[PDB]
Design a protein around this ligand. Structure first.
Ligand SMILES: Nc1nc2c(ncn2[C@@H]2O[C@H]3COP(=O)(O)O[C@@H]4[C@@H](O)[C@H](n5cnc6c(N)ncnc65)O[C@H]4COP(=O)(O)O[C@@H]3[C@H]2O)c(=O)[nH]1
Lengths: 187, 177
């Protein structure tokens, strides 16, 4: 039984989003304070989560797209978690380039449960192919969104950036996709 | 839909157990080399995962039992650290091991506190989570030999001694070595 998406959504919400999002805005503030009249401030205070519905996450997106560039990590959030003293949650600020110059800066990351789905389709078991990985990833996204619609505070502290990928041409820039979202929160 | 246990089991094995267990021996013996002549070695090389079925998972193990005292961190993108604890019995140290809870049970717990999820629903997801993960471990001798579930049903305050439950499993593991 590989019907796993509902689990992934509730696990992501309770085990990460609802634990890390109430502290995010203060760790962005803290970082702005440490480098205020040097680095320049992060204005957008929401966590940007990439959701590639093919479940293709690279281990270093900075080296993936040359228009996405690691800036700094936020101040760490260390916490005792279920017997693990000092479990560490870290988050990263990235810069986005457009047509040469910089154009965006935000706290950004991939939705980690999509890696789970990815490993599941590669593990050699019988009834879980990319087809199923695809429908699981969309059910995951759907359920997580349903969950956030009933959590206004968490919904106001992050932004979900969902996209498929054309596996052919330059039909898609991920920086372009992120920049459009940042210019929608514009509003 | 609250059939969550299946996603919890696959999540916990694929995104954690599968990724930390292979290099657990090496972190232990690096610790043993660092701390041999002073703090002392860690004999038992396996991760011990507490699995309370009532989903009572405090973040500090000493709060669940004063006889479980933190000894030292097991050190070492995304970072994975663990905690070595020592078990007191009759006021004296009786066992040492890398020990932690199965964090996803906290997901089950918070779901019951809400929506559409009751305490019995929770207990049955906890039991389904347990069976599926144990099904997965039986299929992965690699991972199966380097961890141990410690499954129990008491609210971890009482005349139930969680430290005794752990010391029991620790001795049984020494027996089949
Ligand atoms: N980006 C990011 N995501 C995280 C982090 N911690 C958790 N998550 C996400 O939320 C997890 C569910 O939280 P939980 O701690 O209850 O999970 C359980 C947790 O008990 C265990 N685990 C994973 N990493 C660690 C860890 N570093 N330390 C201790 N336990 C860990 O295995 C986790 C499932 O891993 P996963 O597939 O990455 O699952 C999502 C994972 O997508 C994190 O630090 N960074």
């Amino acid at each position: 039984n590989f019907n796993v998406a509902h689990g992934l959504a509730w696990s992501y919400y309770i085990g990460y989003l609802r634990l890390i999002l109430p502290g995010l805005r203060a760790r962005i503030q803290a970082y702005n304070q440490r480098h205020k009249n040097v680095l320049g401030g992060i204005g957008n205070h929401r966590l940007h989560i990439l959701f590639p519905l093919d479940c293709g996450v690279p281990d270093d997106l900075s080296v993936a797209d040359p228009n996405i560039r690691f800036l700094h990590e936020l101040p760490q959030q260390s916490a005792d978690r279920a017997g693990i003293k000092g479990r560490v949650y870290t988050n990263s600020i990235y810069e986005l380039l457009e047509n040469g110059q910089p154009a965006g800066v935000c706290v950004l990351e991939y939705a980690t449960p999509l890696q789970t789905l990815f490993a599941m389709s590669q593990d050699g078991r019988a009834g879980f192919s990319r087809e199923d990985r695809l429908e699981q990833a969309k059910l995951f996204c759907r359920t997580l969104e349903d969950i956030l619609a009933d959590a206004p505070e968490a919904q106001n502290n992050c932004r979900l950036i969902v996209y498929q990928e054309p596996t052919e041409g330059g039909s898609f820039s991920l920086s372009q996709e992120i920049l459009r979202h940042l210019r929608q929160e514009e509003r």
